Amino acid sequence: HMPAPHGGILQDLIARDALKKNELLSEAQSSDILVWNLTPRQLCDIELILNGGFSPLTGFLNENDYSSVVTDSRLADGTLWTIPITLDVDEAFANQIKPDTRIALFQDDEIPIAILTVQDVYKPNKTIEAEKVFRGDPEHPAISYLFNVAGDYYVGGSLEAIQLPQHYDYPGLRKTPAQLRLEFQSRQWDRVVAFQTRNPMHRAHRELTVRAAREANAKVLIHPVVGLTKPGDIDHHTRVRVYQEIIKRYPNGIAFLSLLPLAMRMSGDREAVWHAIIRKNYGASHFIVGRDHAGPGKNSKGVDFYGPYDAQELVESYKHELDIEVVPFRMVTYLPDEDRYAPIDQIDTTKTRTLNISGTELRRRLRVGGEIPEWFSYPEVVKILRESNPPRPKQGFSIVLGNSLTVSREQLSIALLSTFLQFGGGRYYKIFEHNNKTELLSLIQDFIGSGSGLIIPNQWEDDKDSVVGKQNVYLLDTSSSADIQLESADEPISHIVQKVVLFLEDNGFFVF
Amino acid sequence: HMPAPHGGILQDLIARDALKKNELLSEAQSSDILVWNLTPRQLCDIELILNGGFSPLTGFLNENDYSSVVTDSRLADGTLWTIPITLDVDEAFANQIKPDTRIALFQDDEIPIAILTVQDVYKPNKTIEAEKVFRGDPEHPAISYLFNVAGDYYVGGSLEAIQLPQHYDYPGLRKTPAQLRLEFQSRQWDRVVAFQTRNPMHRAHRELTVRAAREANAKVLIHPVVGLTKPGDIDHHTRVRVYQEIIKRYPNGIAFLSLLPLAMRMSGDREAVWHAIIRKNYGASHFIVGRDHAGPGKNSKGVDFYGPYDAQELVESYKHELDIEVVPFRMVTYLPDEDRYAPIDQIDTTKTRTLNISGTELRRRLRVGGEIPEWFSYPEVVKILRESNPPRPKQGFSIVLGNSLTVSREQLSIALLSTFLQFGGGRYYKIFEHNNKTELLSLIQDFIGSGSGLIIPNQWEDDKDSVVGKQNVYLLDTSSSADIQLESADEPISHIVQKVVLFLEDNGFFVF
Ligand code: NA
């Protein structure tokens, strides 16, 4: 039952180029070879290629495959493939390469990853890519990256592997497709259903998953993404701690945890098919496709990027060709009087109690510090989330003295500092003078991340608002754009202080 | 630094007889081939041989290697080897085999394990083996087995791998030498200190092990024995739960758990060297040898089978030759005022407060349901042991109405039953009539194991005492050998019932 890789053969480049390692290593570490440092998304991508995770890929797509993928969701030879995997480069580097040029791809400017043999260098129409691949919405994460982070030139080419990107965390937890397939054989695991996730798992996830295992007669592979998920989500370290904990809530010998160095595009539809392909290469006969699978969410005008079922239908439409089975996850609700989750479909809310916790409410219960029902998520998991996302009483913040203020900045700072220290509780306070220095402005969010309260005497230049981070940063000024608005610019310091103290207290930072 | 298998090459027979599996499988289940059902111990041994764990062995020892092992703890060709791995068969079967004869070794009379090409057939002097290998003391677990269970004819010969013995529990947890070494390579693990154990691990074990890793700059491998340990012990299931729980009390990425299908001989001295060899084949550069390692304990006269440090000394004396480092575990004690364990060596018992819990005191607290300090063993661990080893109020038992009783057996049993039911407490009570049947006597202990209280109307024949089991079985008689001794043979029933009730209450079974 274990699926053959996509395209019939596991492109384990690490294993195929084993004997030539030192040979490739040297060439890569020679001063005669042109060097290109891989960006974060590229590092995740290249790992899956050398890995065989992106079978049948063997390098970054050339214009021929890239175009076929963009317009037909297939490689030039017809193989289903929905996400363009290209090596984006800038004009400068582009002008130093031509077909057959040998490039060395490094990590952190010092670790030899692989040797790339160019065969194509083109300047893709990002308008068409954004439209045909990511549905053209300018706010879509992939399209934003496409235009502001991705180089404007793609470099098609074949790769020869030196070593997979270096990782120092979760060793042996990042099993390659070959290792996973071998692990499944050790356990005599025939049928395996894989679960995609870039989020923490709660009881519902544990139940829906065990259910899939039961109905599909397969074992469970919890395959969390730890490379790059949606921008601004929970760090993977925290998620992995949650996974390692929830894995213990499954009957013994039913589930296995393994991390996927994937860099998502949040391209729902196509991404789902891409996900099915990837797990297939990793050895899964079944793939769970959730509601709005890999969906960013809603845009500015509240419009959804993808339809709630777009992903499940797309994968379902290609499953026979992919030779995998799709396990659709229907929306579910909790029935208190039975202590069980059930498909919304079969519930008459008119004659049955139902409980549900939205992501917003959860984010709120972690901000406020309120209890989280044990039926929604396991105790151990909630504790883990509580540590990473502390309630406002344990959160850091920053109070910036507006430019409109005329009071003694030094005195107001001393006054605020002295005042905050009366409340105590654990938070460390500091009058922070940056002097419009980037080396110091870059530390603001670090102190806030540490729960520290910073009193900042002056504002920084607008051409640096990007160096800081708006999170928990409040402006004290007379302007209508301030978070703490003073009626005048020459108010008594005690007047000003009280306004700030009560503001913070109202926002939950101080508790008495 | 990762040692090379003992003998130079890992004898992973399963891997060398792969391209011959179907072929060998056929011969095994063929009608002509002579078949032999592998005994439980023979299964653990054969699995280690086909495994490679017993490198350089490639089959059971013949008379040449055997005698060499017995007298000089080495194999004919010199190679270090202290424990005699041989195929013990009965007389009858020995007479159907001659040199070059091929035998099919089965598991549970239906699973083809391996084909054996006989080379030797001899009747070893068990009086010499018991002496030179296990020190002679008749009460020694290995010598007892040697005479009362082991066959009298050893069959030497080579083996051809069909498949390792079947296990449905802890799949993928029982990694082979080849697998472990791979698992180590995947984690960039070079130096590995292996920890051996056939018992639960407590905080002391976690601390000593972590300390070992720190001193030898190595990762930790918890390598528990799940085959056959010491007669009458904690089943490997309970211990595995304990291991999987304590394995989580280690710094992330420091330790790894793997099960060893070893059938210990409890041969302290020699077995420690044997363990070092085995662990060496598994990829461990460091091995922990503790106080009275693999020691049976004390005999009747209260005399130790082995000296506290015989095992550490022996392995230490062969380490250079074995090419592995020995990590000695020194006796330790708990320091309350410092919350840490320290060697008895540097502790001024006079000026220092120290706490220790004996194996006997632990056994007592589990029987009584008393508290077990957090410093001694992790809560999760205690929970597990408590559930596997229930305290008296949750224990089962049997009251056997003696032969000397002249009172009505039908009425006494009924009175005991109705009286017991008054107390409640979750225990299930039953009047059990065996009629001296084996099919029924064999269930007595199963019932007691289920926490039940059995009321047995009559004693069973002496020729069947071996079919029952002494644990929590009490005799109500007049004889001085009775557990609940009665003054006369025809005491009023109410009088008898009370003596029995108060006896069970004084012994913990009843709590009010
Ligand atoms: Na990037």
Curated annotation (Swiss-Prot), chains A, B:
The keyword Iron does not apply. Induction: Expression depends on the formation of the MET4-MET28-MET31 and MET4-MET28-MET32 complexes on its 5' upstream region. The keyword Nucleotidyltransferase applies. Keywords: ATP-binding, Cytoplasm, Nucleotide-binding, Nucleotidyltransferase, Transferase. GO terms for cellular component: cytoplasm; mitochondrion. It catalyses: sulfate + ATP + H(+) = adenosine 5'-phosphosulfate + diphosphate. The record marks H202, H205 as: Transition state stabilizer. ATP binds at Q196, T197, R198, N199, G290, R291, D292, H293, V332. Signal peptide: none annotated. The record marks F329 as: Induces change in substrate recognition on ATP binding. Present with 1510 molecules/cell in log phase SD medium. Catalyzes the first intracellular reaction of sulfate assimilation, forming adenosine-5'-phosphosulfate (APS) from inorganic sulfate and ATP. Plays an important role in sulfate activation as a component of the biosynthesis pathway of sulfur-containing amino acids. The oligomerization domain is distantly related to APS kinases, but it is not functional and does not bind APS. It is required for oligomerization of the enzyme, although the oligomerization state has no effect on the catalytic activity of the enzyme. Belongs to the sulfate adenylyltransferase family. This is Sulfate adenylyltransferase. The lineage of its organism: Eukaryota, Fungi, Dikarya, Ascomycota, Saccharomycotina.
